[PDB]
């Protein structure tokens, strides 16, 4: 292996896989630090008027979305993946699992599922969850 990499547990993958053909759109997880993997926390309805309100304020999390959008004169939707975490009170470990897991978790929607994903938007707070920044992100200055 190029470098350090863990697995996803069944259940998170059990979600990412119907996620992958816009079945659930509102995937919510977390780290299971008791063997180093990421596990399924939630799959409640969210849209990204209410997406705020999943994400915490006192620990690291792991959410997907399907963000919609238009360019060139056609109009478009597909995966979005979305990470908090507030670094003021989480504990050491949590938040070095996460950012580890953060590549491979990646490759099991890219190439495990061969999805694609529009963005890998970051968030402090999940307050600045919304279609402007959702916009903003995808379509940068760059």
Do not use: W
Request: proline share 4%; with cysteine.
């Amino acid at each position: 292996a190029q470098g350090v990499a863990f697995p996803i547990s069944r259940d998170a993958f059990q979600a990412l896989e119907k996620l992958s053909k816009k079945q659930l759109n509102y995937v919510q997880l977390e780290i299971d630090i008791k063997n180093e993997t990421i596990i399924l926390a939630n799959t409640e309805n969210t849209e990204l008027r209410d997406l705020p309100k999943r994400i915490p304020k006192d620990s690291a999390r792991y959410h997907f979305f399907l963000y919609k959008h238009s360019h060139e004169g056609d109009y478009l939707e597909s995966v979005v993946f979305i990470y908090s975490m507030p670094g003021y009170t989480c504990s050491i470990r949590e938040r070095m699992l996460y950012s580890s897991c953060k590549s491979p978790l990646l490759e099991i929607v890219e190439r495990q599922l061969q999805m694609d994903v529009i963005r890998k938007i970051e968030i402090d707070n999940g307050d600045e969850l919304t279609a402007d920044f959702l916009y903003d992100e995808v379509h940068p200055k760059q």
